[PDB]
Chains A and B, each alone.
With several copies, the nearest count.
Chain A
Amino acid sequence: IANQPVVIDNGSGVIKAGFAGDQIPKYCFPNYVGRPKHVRVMAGALEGDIFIGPKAEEHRGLLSIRYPMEHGIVKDWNDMERIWQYVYSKEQLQTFSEEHPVLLTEAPLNPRKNRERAAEVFFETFNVPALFISMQAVLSLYATGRTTGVVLDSGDGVTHAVPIYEGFAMPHSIMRIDIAGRDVSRFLRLYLRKEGYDFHSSSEFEIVKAIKERACYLSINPQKDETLETEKAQYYLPDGSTIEIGPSRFRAPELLFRPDLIGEESEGIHEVLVFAIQKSDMDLRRTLFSNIVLSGGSTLFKGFGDRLLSEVKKLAPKDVKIRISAPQERLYSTWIGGSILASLDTFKKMWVSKKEYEEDGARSIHRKTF
């Protein structure tokens, strides 16, 4: 039973889905399970009471949105099961879980208990013939067509750097922080309360993400922007009310480089990228500096790569050629590589079959991933 396998790029913010050997993921929607805040009195209302995908994006104001997945660590399993059931349902894919093998994605250095429970869901609740969990950094390199390179990515949950050299991922040189898009949006929300405009509700949180996506830019010199007075640019909400954002728009994404602002003494994106290159072997460092691949959502800030370069120029050894490559399709780079990995003939050897899982269990899944 070797049908066209399904690639599901998991993540805290957004969940991409689709079939192998496609150019772009056709089925992208945000990873959350909205449930209604108000009491349905009238008949002919929205049926079901559990809303995932575009219906949730259309009817945000009704639904109390809550995310099941934080920092690449699923908290609520019942919600993730309903999301994966929605992916496979007739509203999106129009296929059965029994036909196709699955390609799953997870962030590196996650809990092994979550990986085991992920496999239990796909093998037992859904009746998948073969599952395969893989890393995001390896898939991003598949999408670019490279073999060498450090992979700085920044989704909604996790920011991590994986140094890989000619198809050799170094697990001990991996760095990781739990400071990413969601924490930047949460830090922006807190700053807008200091400005004046509060967005306390859970549906109203999605407005802060929309402000962060559109109206934010990373300044090169933060001390110079702090001394100067801002212009206070405007932004229109979904209602119509105007909002002067002020200095919060540039100070909000600075969380990624300075994680002491939120109150969590970590490295930062630029330090993680240097640390990953430093922890790797001496002869590989110069090739790892030249090949740096960007990915995820929080790399799409304005002047992000300019600041990332300037930070590497500050930290790294002098007279060394830095190159921070960035594709066009940075959000879908992790999915595209999965679709490429799925299409290859080697894919049949990498996966965990259903029969193999029934015999061994979790140990076979831990062996095949690494």
Chain B
Amino acid sequence: MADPKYADLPGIARNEPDVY
């Protein structure tokens, strides 16, 4: 979208893997 500052390819979140 429009406006000066964005970050491209950080991702929405960083998550640990879910174990059983």
Contact = CB atoms under 8 A, between A and B. Distances in A.
A207 interface: no
Contacts of B11: 326
A325 interface: yes
A330 B19 CA distance: 30
Contacts of B4: 28
Interface string A317-361: 001111111111111100000000000000000000000000000
A192 to B, nearest CB: 22
A24 B6 CA distance: 13
Which secondary structure characterizes the binding site on chain A? loop
Contacts, number: 48
B15 A329 contact: no
Nearest to B6: A328
Nearest to A325: B13
A194 B4 CA distance: 31
A321 B15 contact: yes
Interface residues of B, number: 16
Interface in A187-237: 213
Given A24-B2, A24-B3, A300-B5, A328 B12 contact: yes
A326 B16 contact: no
B19 A319 contact: yes
A321 B3 contact: no
Interface of A: 23-25, 28, 213, 297, 300, 305-306, 309, 313, 319-332
Closest CB pairs A-B (n = 4): A325-B13, A323-B15, A322-B16, A305-B14
